[PDB]
Design a protein around this ligand. Structure first.
Ligand SMILES: [Mg+2]
Ligand SMILES: [Mg+2]
Ligand SMILES: [Mg+2]
Ligand SMILES: [Mg+2]
Length: 50
RNA sequence: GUGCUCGCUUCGGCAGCACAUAUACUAAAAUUGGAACGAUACAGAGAAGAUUAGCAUGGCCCCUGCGCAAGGAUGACACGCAAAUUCGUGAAGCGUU
């Protein structure tokens, strides 16, 4: 019954599931780089990026 | 530069005439930028359970190939809270002309 519910719920394949996780990881690394850049601008250190 | 001048006129010089008439992306440089795999960590291969052949499609994505062949993971990407013009009924409660 548990496998029945878990397979009646699913519609997504491999690539959609890796892209959703990749979007969450991109959001996480964006917030992390945002925090680092906000600290570098808050204390004041003008390191430029590429 | 050379030759000819019944040129001065010596073998020294000068004069005249003739022929000959415009190289070089100008550097042995100074500069200026974008770039070599590939190593560093991470990262993991589509199709509604799982294991999988693939053929396409589109373009500010390319690589290998002489290729209008064929490969590159079906080469990669594409996965979207997929909302575009324009509304009306019926009673019910409350306030108003
Ligand atoms: Mg599958
Ligand atoms: Mg092919
Ligand atoms: Mg395959
Ligand atoms: Mg293809």
């Amino acid at each position: 019954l548990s496998e029945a519910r878990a397979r009646l719920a699913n519609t997504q394949g491999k690539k959609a599931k890796r892209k959703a996780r990749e979007k969450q990881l991109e959001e996480a690394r964006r917030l992390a780089a945002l925090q680092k850049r906000r600290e570098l601008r808050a204390a004041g250190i003008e390191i430029q990026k590429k």
